[PDB]
Amino acid sequence: TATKHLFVSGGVASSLGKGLTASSLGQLLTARGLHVTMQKLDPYLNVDPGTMNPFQHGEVFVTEDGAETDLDVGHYERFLDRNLPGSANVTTGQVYSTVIAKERRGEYLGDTVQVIPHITDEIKRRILAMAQPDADGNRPDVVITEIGGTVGDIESQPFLEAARQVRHYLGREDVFFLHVSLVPYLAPSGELKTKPTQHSVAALRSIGITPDALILRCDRDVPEALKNKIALMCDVDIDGVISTPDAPSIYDIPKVLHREELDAFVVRRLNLPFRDVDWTEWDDLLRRVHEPHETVRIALVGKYVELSDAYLSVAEALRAGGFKHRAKVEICWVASDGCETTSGAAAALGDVHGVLIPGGFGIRGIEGKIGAIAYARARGLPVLGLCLGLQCIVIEAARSVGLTNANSAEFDPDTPDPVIATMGTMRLGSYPAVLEPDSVVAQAYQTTQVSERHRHRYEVNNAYRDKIAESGLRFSGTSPDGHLVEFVEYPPDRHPFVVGTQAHPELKSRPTRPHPLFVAFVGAAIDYKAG
Amino acid sequence: TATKHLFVSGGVASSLGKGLTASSLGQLLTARGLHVTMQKLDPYLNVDPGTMNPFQHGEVFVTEDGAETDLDVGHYERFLDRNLPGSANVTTGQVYSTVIAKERRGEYLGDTVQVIPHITDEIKRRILAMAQPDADGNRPDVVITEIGGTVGDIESQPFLEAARQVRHYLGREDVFFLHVSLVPYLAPSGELKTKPTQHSVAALRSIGITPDALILRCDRDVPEALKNKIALMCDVDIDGVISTPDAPSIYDIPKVLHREELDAFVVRRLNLPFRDVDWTEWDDLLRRVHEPHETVRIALVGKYVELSDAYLSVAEALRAGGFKHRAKVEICWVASDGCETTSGAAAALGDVHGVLIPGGFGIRGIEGKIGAIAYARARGLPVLGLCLGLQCIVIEAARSVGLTNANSAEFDPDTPDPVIATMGGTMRLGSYPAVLEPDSVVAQAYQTTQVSERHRHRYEVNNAYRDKIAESGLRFSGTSPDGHLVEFVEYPPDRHPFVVGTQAHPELKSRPTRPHPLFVAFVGAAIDYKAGEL
Ligand SMILES: [Ca+2]
Ligand SMILES: [Ca+2]
């Protein structure tokens, strides 16, 4: 059968949960036995979200191919269990750069390069690019493309036009349009208004797009009488009007959309092959979420506290590790700067059962993260260091030996002992790593050969390897040639669990398929909870 | 006094004469004794219009600094007599190319780059850049910025928004808004429609711009009773509503706007220094336009026929040369392809008095232009070759000598005799100096031994073939200061009265009030040819 295209558009208010709404539909379609790939059209002029502040706009997701993408790609990968390419994230900057480059080359044969067709054509080409067969020659069944930004925006105007152009290229039978809108509840009158959805569909119909289904994001349950009024008001089928109330968990949303029969409506409208939903895997996850046997507290020693979206994949990997042990993970958002002193670190990491050191990119406060490891080693708390975390474990290890001036060249260039230095060369995407047999990392992974996603340029100095080894720390994980240090660990006879990784395992972690390092880390924190 | 900004916005229909309406206002303000600089905002994504087809979108104007700009810059330069910089032509492509480069450099420091403010900021920076003092430290009095495209388009939306921010940042006393609209005449009812003007002003008011004056482009005279109705309908001052009927000539438009007192209204509203218009120079031009003593036919041997906008500066330079002799120039648009054969060239260039070979950039049909020179040399017609024209004179000169396979490397790369070749080579753009041979035809025209002209080419004359080309009688009268590059070629008067070729484009430096000496000498030579048939 021909490849289908589903477009998810957002109106009225922003950050409604449009990413999760689309991912949950992707989960249902994959559970129905279909090849589903997902794309996100960000309307900002930035080429890569790498230049953007992660503590203001969210974490930078890294794919297997080594592309810096939006955090929405992470939601897609977790809900599908499938690895996505770099082409899954399209920006206004990426499109406008490609079109201007071609114009300067003379690839438009003496024509006035305008948004329509030149820009809309490039967007259209990037959308239809997902329909091409992937690795092992597999063509997808349905492509869910999320058109970012509010319907009616200047930055969203060319992306919606390309989505409309695709609808006329393939036909009504191959293209579906889903629109997410907010239904607000007024406290003094005690009634929900249909006016925001009415003008949102009108703004979408003015640009030339007729929506097939409507997602009504609300705090309460939308009544059948009100749903019937919206159905006539927007000329949307009554079976297509979906009431999506605020779910207790993000993993409850696929069950909410299934109850409203949206997944069955999508298959029937696009004439896709029908097959019942296999809840066997998702029900096992829901049982681990709603029925936990234990509660474990794990501290996240990050630069900026409270904000979950700065370390979204890290927090999701921690919860995933907890589900394997059938326990609830309470993330303690600890500010790194407070752990600079041994007294301050003790007051912040006192009541916790585990300590995690995430990878800080372009940060300046490193001394706090080093101090957090120093306390955790003395108290006997399990430590999991990611990217900068491994670098901080190495600095603390060298400092405990006797090297008082041991630091990273990235933070202190005039250091007389640079234990962390370039060569430099930037590492992005999946990199292979050989593991030492019978080690803590080998016991977790249960294999001597692994592959993890990287995003850094600073490595462990090979000259200081002997001086660092004096602390007891062992370089269990190295590159195939053994030149680059990938994993560091303390033996169980010295510390139960102090493992550091140069890569980001949180990206490869899924709620249905948790990462073995996070499983071993959460498990070690449960062992700490006893006594 | 503080630098003023005037914004010209076009609505409803396109190509009505937005460029000419703005240039005529620029002419009046300069005639009132004010430093006027003009800017054109193009909404296309092309960084330089040099990549565009000239026979589809118009000629590509070259400034003194060496920038490829829109043909509207040419209208500004001719109506002001002032040389404009590369900053006078700002495109969507330029703005987006700068902001994306800035973003990648991290100059926006962890921020989501959006149209508002990042894009509008670059446009606002580009407009305010014209207000900066020019060469010898001279700051302009008023800056006329023309916003290309219809008011209401998504492509021209950030350019209008920047003008609104310029109005906000500087003030109402320093920023003026002019809107050009069409008033159509209905044949069955016999009345003018106010609806296209009302809907256009409403579209300008919806984006947040209140127009100060309205230009009503019409075929007939707009009545004072109708002008009063539109004034109230658009909330524009009655003294600001200007009726602009279709003028017989493009040089009549400044006189039309002066009669409606638009120039005086602009000065009064912006609180600019008032001084009466010095018509001394413009009236002399109008007399040469409307009262010609002679009529001379000059053929324009170009690849495409009839389309004037492809060779706009060339046609305007030809008319300018005619005004100096107080004569009307009838341009004969001749297709180059037809002049390939000697019989076809004779049938096309038979009744003409002068032959002109313009500069064809990115063209393929060169053999026709060579054949046109071959006939003109035999018939005894004056020849003026521009850029490719000089190259074609050189090829024809070498071919008459005996080199049957002599051609340009640009058109035939496998030629055994490349008389025209690069140096890969280097692209020459802008004003380049040239030393002239004393007592030569070009020196007699220019009346100086040292000249400067604007270039836009990559291929030069092969210095190895200089001796073989010289056998025809052709002399390299114009060369670079070092003498390595050939700039001008000419035949002696004892061989041919006027066969002059130039490597550069003199048509760009030609003005209606200040004509180019080469075009004056060429038109004059064509008048001499007419005298020879009596
Ligand atoms: Ca985001
Ligand atoms: Ca044009």
Author numbering:
A (entry chain A): 7 to 429, 444 to 551
B (entry chain B): 7 to 429, 443 to 553
What did the study's authors say about this model?
The combined data indicate that 7947882 and 7904688 are prodrugs activated by the EthA monooxygenase, which then target PyrG, a cytidine triphosphate (CTP) synthetase catalyzing the ATP-dependent amination of uridine triphosphate (UTP) to form the essential pyrimidine nucleotide CTP. The crystal structure of PyrG was solved by molecular replacement on a 2.0-Å resolution data set. This structure showed a bidomain enzyme with an N-terminal amidoligase (ALase) domain, also commonly known as the synthetase domain (residues 1–278), connected through an interdomain linker (residues 279–Pro298) to a C-terminal glutamine amidotransferase (GATase) domain (residues 299–552), both domains displaying a Rossmann-like fold. On the other hand, the 34-residue C-terminal extension of M. tuberculosis PyrG, which has no predicted secondary structure or known function, could not be traced due to the lack of supporting electron density, suggesting a high degree of flexibility.
Indeed, another structure of the enzyme in the apo form at lower resolution (3.5 Å), revealed a homodimeric protein, each homodimer representing half of the functional tetramer and showing a dimerization surface of ∼1,350 Å2 per monomer, all in good agreement with previous structural studies (Endrizzi et al., 2004, 2005; Goto et al., 2004; Lauritsen et al., 2011).
